[model samples]
Target: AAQTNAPWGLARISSTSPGTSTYYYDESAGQGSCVYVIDTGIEASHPEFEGRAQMVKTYYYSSRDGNGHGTHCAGTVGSRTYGVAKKTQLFGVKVLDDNGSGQYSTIIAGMDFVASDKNNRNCPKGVVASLSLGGGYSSSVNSAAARLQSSGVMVAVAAGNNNADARNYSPASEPSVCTVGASDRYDRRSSFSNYGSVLDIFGPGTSILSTWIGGSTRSISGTSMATPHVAGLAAYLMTLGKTTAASACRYIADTANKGDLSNIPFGTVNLLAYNNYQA
Candidate 1:
């Protein structure tokens, strides 16, 4: 049912555990879906991306991923080798600068660009806006996320990496978006991931190897790394005709690997994203 040697995080999120041989669904599962990564930026020239990724400057940062975070997240979202939805289309929104720091106001503006009527009317379904950047709570971010959701785009965001309650973070605390925390290779909550009722799901976030700037690869860790897996899953669902944002989020929460968690909170143990149809 799955292939032996599928990427670790990609296979884990797509309902196949690592080290097992099974047939992965074809890339058609996300062929027409689209994802927008709102972070530093992406190295569109990265070989892992090939024809899958495009870059746009929603903010003043360079089009290249000087910080390497955005490129890695983009790889997880749609790169051919490390992505959950290997054939999905990808875009970049540069809200965070080369230093990986930005104003919440800038992020809201980036959301506006993603949800603007011009963009909304073009690709109506299977659109996922993924953000791995965060700061203190901001009502504007929540409102922006709600607006995009209402316009038919799914928002997948990161629970902060602070190891505290995710409620203290901005987009994660935003109820309209699907907030994701980090898990480890053993399917346990990563020690640095924020938790509590604010998080909707968890994904592998530690020592993840993905595409980096200068067309290379690197291993990194954070809730930031975890966020794109869910975004890719959302894109996969979109190609399967699950067009509504709420429906995709609900299916992911309902179909997660609930039994694998250990000592995790009751409502926070949806460790691995899984494809119900894969079985």
Candidate 2:
């Protein structure tokens, strides 16, 4: 099959055609939407961002990402080339440190910061957050995630990479957030991806290529990579006036290509995310 310069993840989610070679999206993809990338912080000057990425807040000791996880996630959500929502404004709120690790307290602060941002008149409607990090069960973090969504910022978070039940993890286990699992180029579940009822949908995650720190791009695998795809889709929906967290989630659920993911664990939903949804 002929291929476009687009990544497989982009091709995979944009169409239901039985292949992964071309991406299909409106030119304005996410032009009118916004996403908060609450992770390590973005390399705002990266050419891929084209001045659309910015640091809105940070709890990290450093102002920029020493780790590329947030940049990668941000790119997947809204970069000019690698993003699902190609033009969405990306706001960074770093909570993790150099190791891509942080306390529940710090993570909650980032969540609170984004949640509060939604209440401001300056913040755009249908705000979304691409949360690619989480840990063991933490009621406080889970509660914060819930509040963040209730505040009108649609959240798409990792379902963890332990290859175990997602219920054992925080935020992923939270029913309020859109918990994303991983599918590979073959449209099968990635062996390292967590599953079970907590997973709301699946996205291409294996070897996903996205923007990185210091003006580069990298291919990383995890439910982390899968999440921003969902975030991008949510933002795309919001761009069409689906202006609430619930609206985006419900729209995604309704329009997602169903029974498409193969080799999924018995109880996991067989939905593979498709971004061709229109308002």
Candidate 3:
């Protein structure tokens, strides 16, 4: 852990080895792109956002974050220092409340909002929706995400932390969206990460440190932490002209570092997320 001050996940995706101590990304990598984080809202004023993060809509009190989950996830997506896409715009679409939970109807409201909101952006790269929340299988939620993707927003969802087939979950099982699982610094699947044929990729999720509410930071482990990493990658790739949802999804999976991770269950895709730093 003698690496530079950058978080391990940042360095992990940028390079092939775990001991690599720095993140390498294009200076203009995330410019002109937008990432919508569908969670409990974000602390938009958190210094990590560098004025690019904002609350676009909320299911509750005044488009602000009461719980820190959304802020942490958004930080990974585009925080000034800890982000995967340092220059991308982050929009907070809060569906969950302070308890980090939400009704299926509430999540649908947020998803529908993003599907309709992208038409109003000045973004030249494209739009991406990062859904770090999920529940038991729900065809309605799955269709909403699919419809969001069809509406020009690349969708990314978390493979739940259930230690079982990801197909049992909502958005993760949805083929129209990219389903992401979690890996550790050792390039092994995290013990709690759900896996299955539905899993499209993996990201470093353990001990991920990111900005929290009230202008601070924290380290947490979950598939929730891994998702924005991929979501940001989708947006970052879009900045390079892979603008369509299918296009971004194809590039991430096709260009991923193949078969290098350990502890993967049979039939799971072995592709771990990569930033194409040395590809």
Candidate 4:
């Protein structure tokens, strides 16, 4: 992996993977908002993410190049001028390097930078943070994900790659964090997903399609890829003045394909009507 200082930004793109189409229908775009993608730094040069995007700020704690994970996550959430939130800007943060693994301390530091935003305000007005990296339930029990929500920076996290609910990590377990689970193209839970009461939302994760570094097409399944879908949807909701994280969660719950869940998780997701929905 090579690190490039040249910054590429996020694009607003509409998507249709059958499993995810229901969440970003006609009503999702009119809301008009931007989201900050928080993952391995987006490559910022993928064809689907060239000039059509806007670069806010990028924090690279590691010497990683075109962190493919973050860029792929971005594409799935918002890529090539189409996504649930078609007008959001993604801010890149390379917490995990080319190796795609970061320390808890580095992750915390990266998040602190995200929350600080001391100098960069020309970027997106709001942030629906996304994260697709996690080794297990042991990554960092108490870190920046806890701080972001308190700071009004809504975050979306992967529910871990384990198929068992007995193990998962901190941020996803955070009550304030929105944990996204993985559903295959068939709309059934992915074999690699971690399920528990903590899970907040579900998205297409199995054999999913998105942009790759150096201009390529690929699919890697994990809750990591699935989480961004919720993040993109939240960007649209937040821009509409549905600023509350809880509200955004509710909107997804209400708008999601009812066929996806057998027994829904606990909590209240504001079920906003998606028909003719406008922010």
Candidate 5:
């Protein structure tokens, strides 16, 4: 355990193996394209993110956590050298103030802002949005996310941290969304992760090590860290297959390493070992 490089508390208790991380890294699970994380706001100045992220735009709907959860989650997804998609572009939307929380309407408004791409300076082609936070479901907001997808924008959402099925959250519960659950490198479910048929796949969420604000590095738990892993992967797959979300999801599903779902809750998603896809 002392040899573990994982930084989060849960990872200290339950860590992802280096061998698994090496599998994805050597295989190049994420290579090119851009991913946007709609969260509090990332610390663009952070050393781990400096040359790696080309932030298109940032807006703060709330005034809090100038250094907080949004940046923490962003680092996991696209920090320069720490995250899966270090070379990818990032769109940091600060909807949930510094409190690590926000209202549904506020979140939707930020998403809607991106949806209106008449001015394409912020969100150009090959831009996929990653909303790593979600809570109580809302029909209007859910509809908006689906609309974004229709515009060629893919979304990855966290199912929540409650460990319950994703029957309550709007984005993760929606069929159009890629609901990501947390799992260790061994492919076992993290005790704090949510479970449900709605979940699209699992990613490295528990004890994920990445950048924090102020040049400091730390770890945190939750579906929050896991959702971005897939978001980064989606961007890589998009570049490789030149495919849509439906096709990308289908490709990964068809290539899942775990064969028997009769025992596992969501059929044991093993993304680190897939080999059939062209990109």
Candidate 6:
């Protein structure tokens, strides 16, 4: 099968069809969904984004992607080459700082703003959240995640890179939140990915190529990279008329290509493949 410049992660997940002439799922590229990246700021001028990304809110940093992490994740969420929901509206909600870290309160505030509808933060089609940042488990973060889900926003979070149990983390352990862990192209768990019963799914994260700051592209690895793949998929599901957070989550869980995984514990499983999606 021939291939294009599309990221290998997309191929592994079956998000793009490969054959004599490869093509993407343009027909269902998340046209009616909105994804909020709760991480560092994004590069608004990045060409791959097609100038669709908006800095909806910033909690700690200013309107620049000093750390470049947010841009990478955002690109995987909805950029032309590296995204799952290529046409989904991208919203940058900066919660992490230039140091790639943020206080729990600051993260909660950003989540609150995205989940709120008073200021028109909620989009009409539906809303999804991607968070690659993490810290020690906090009741406050869990509460915020629950509130966001209750408000009809699907939240996807990284299961942390500490290689320990994800139950020790904040959003990963939060009930109803879609917790993502790292998986390589070989379908093996990344060495640094945290796992256990707390993880909701596994996604491509190792050596992931995506858009970066300065209108460039780069490859990085972590459960952080895996987080956006699921986030983008959630948004894609929303474009199928699955509006509520629970509905998006249920569709993904029910339709996920499962059964294959490596180096994961007994209770944990994989949900990265998307062969059944129209896209």
All models: lDDT?
0.77, 0.84, 0.87, 0.58, 0.61, 0.79
C-alpha-based local distance difference test score of model 1: 0.77
Top model number, lDDT: 3
Off by over 4 Å in 1: 1-4, 16-23, 117-125, 266-271, 277-279
On residues 1-279, what C-alpha lDDT tens digit does candidate 1 reach at each position?
354666566666755454442427554657777788888888888888877788866577367779889999999887887777777888888898888898888888888887763264334446888888888887888787778766767888899899888887888888778888887776778888888787888887877778888888888988889989888888877787754555677778877877665546666655567666555
State which candidate, 1 or 6, has the greater lDDT: 6
Q: 59-117, model 2: which lDDT tens digit per residue?
A: 86676988999999999998988898888889999988877889999998899998787
Estimate, for each residue in 85-164, the C-alpha lDDT of model 5 and write its tens digit. 55566667776676677788877877786666423643323667788778887787788777766666777888778878
Looking at model 3, the pairs that clash are none
Global local distance difference test of model 5: 0.61
lDDT of the structure predicted as candidate 3: 0.87
Q: What tens digits encode model 6's per-residue C-alpha lDDT throughout 1-279?
A: 223766767666665222212324546678768888888989978999997788877876387888889999999998988888888889999998877988899888988988873247535567888888989898889888878867778888889999989988988888688888888877788899998787887888998899999889999999989989888888876776654655676666667667766788778766654635443
Q: For every model shown, what is its TM-score relative to the native structure?
A: 0.91, 0.95, 0.96, 0.77, 0.80, 0.91
lDDT of 4 by residue, 101-214 (tens): 767777777667767762355433365667777654544544577776566576778878877562357567776677777766544567876777767667656666676677
**What lDDT score goes with residue 123 in model 5?**
32
lDDT of 3 by residue, 110-193 (tens): 999998888898778889989999899999999988988788888999999989999989888899899999998888899899
Q: Show pairs that collide, candidate 6.
A: none
Q: How many backbone clashes does candidate 1 have?
A: 5
How close to the true structure is residue 76 of candidate 2, measured as C-alpha lDDT? 95
Clashes (candidate 3): 0
**Which portions of model 3 miss their true places by more than 4 Å?**
1-4
Q: What is the C-alpha RMSD of each candidate to the true structure, in Å?
A: 2.2, 2.3, 2.1, 7.1, 5.1, 2.8
lDDT of 6 at 53: 86
Name the runs in model 4 displaced over 4 angstroms: 1-32, 52-64, 123-125, 138-141, 241-246, 262-279
